Design a protein around this ligand. Sequence first.
Ligand SMILES: OC[C@H]1O[C@@H](O[C@H]2[C@H](O)[C@@H](O)[C@@H](O)O[C@@H]2CO)[C@H](O)[C@@H](O)[C@H]1O
Ligand SMILES: OC[C@H]1O[C@@H](O[C@H]2[C@H](O)[C@@H](O)[C@@H](O)O[C@@H]2CO)[C@H](O)[C@@H](O)[C@H]1O
Lengths: 148, 148
Amino acid sequence: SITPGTYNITNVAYTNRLIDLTGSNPAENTLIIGHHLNKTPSGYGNQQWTLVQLPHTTIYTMQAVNPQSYVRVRDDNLVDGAALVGSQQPTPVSIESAGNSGQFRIKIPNLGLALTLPSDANSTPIVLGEVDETSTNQLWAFESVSAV
Amino acid sequence: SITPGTYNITNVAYTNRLIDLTGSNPAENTLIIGHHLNKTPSGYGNQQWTLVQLPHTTIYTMQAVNPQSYVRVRDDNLVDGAALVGSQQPTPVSIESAGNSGQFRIKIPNLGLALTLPSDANSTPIVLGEVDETSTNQLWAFESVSAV
Ligand SMILES: OC[C@H]1O[C@@H](O[C@H]2[C@H](O)[C@@H](O)[C@@H](O)O[C@@H]2CO)[C@H](O)[C@@H](O)[C@H]1O
Ligand SMILES: OC[C@H]1O[C@@H](O[C@H]2[C@H](O)[C@@H](O)[C@@H](O)O[C@@H]2CO)[C@H](O)[C@@H](O)[C@H]1O
């Protein structure tokens, strides 16, 4: 399984789009979106995500570097089409390899729903969609940030 | 939520029945059962269960003190009636306060299923049942293992 640490997370369909917390805003219910890299080499703190793992499982929490907001499904509403947002409390996710190449799905445990990016337009919000075998817009690549 | 540590776990419908790994057997797919207390004051290692928590959530793993088998649903088959067993790999569980006191429900994350004891007969297997907030057969009392 993926090592605990800090990462930039890029979409497999749209390789110019990173997971991004809108405006670096710390407020409840701030939207999580797909957006162009915002500074070289590894973005500002709203494009860097720290993973904490439950040992001997694929269950994690995800938290931005600055401001320190967790990934959550809005209103804990675990259904097709619901928004992803920043919050003071996390939704637990299952991060699972999709084959022998470095790609992953980010799933809601036991429900057959996953994070998806529905267009390449800059600033498109990320939402839940149905799990399947062939859509590339629900696959994601992880690159370590050396930080410091 | 409940503090990480090592516990005896007793049913609320049937207060003479503890969670027990059959015969202290380390083999894969050994049944987990309700059974009378097998040693004073706190049982042998097959009646003592260690909890590890994912921070800022109610998600845990459960593992016996001796032999070191995890709690798992047989074949990862998350349906009404399925068997609980000992294994080298865990099923993640959501442990939540209920009823009233040092009383808790042991639920499958995001599904309407929970661990239940259907009879007071000695050595009855523990299985999944539908969530029902009025049923004492799916409520459990947690007591820390004394410090010899
Ligand atoms: O609109 C999404 C992008 O916002 C950028 O931050 C802006 C911000 O939206 C605006 O309100 C103001 O504060 O200027 C900022 C730029 O200096 C983020 O930097 C970008 O990553 C997107 O989230
Ligand atoms: O039958 C369930 C109980 O088994 C007990 O272990 C017995 C075992 O069944 C028996 O075959 C033989 O090995 O002697 C053991 C007693 O030392 C457990 O001790 C009890 O907790 C139940 O699991």
